[PDB]
Amino acid sequence: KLPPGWEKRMFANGTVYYFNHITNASQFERPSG
Numbered sequence: 001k002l003p004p005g006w007e008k009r010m011f012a013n014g015t016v017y018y019f020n021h022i023t024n025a026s027q028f029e030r031p032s033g
């Protein structure tokens with residue numbers, strides 16, 4: 001779903017997440033993408 005400033009990333013060991021590039025917070029909460 002994602003609050004303001006959260007956008008998609010991935011861990012090289014194989015896991016997708018969403019990262020707040022305004023604070024550096026990281027969570028698995030997924031939007032349409």
Ligand SMILES: *[C@@H]1O[C@H](CO)[C@@H](O)[C@H](O)[C@H]1NC(C)=O
Pocket residue numbers: 011012013014015
């Ligand atoms: C990959 O490493 C990250 C950071 O420790 C962790 O959050 C993620 O769950 C890991 N995924 C796998 C499949 O190893």
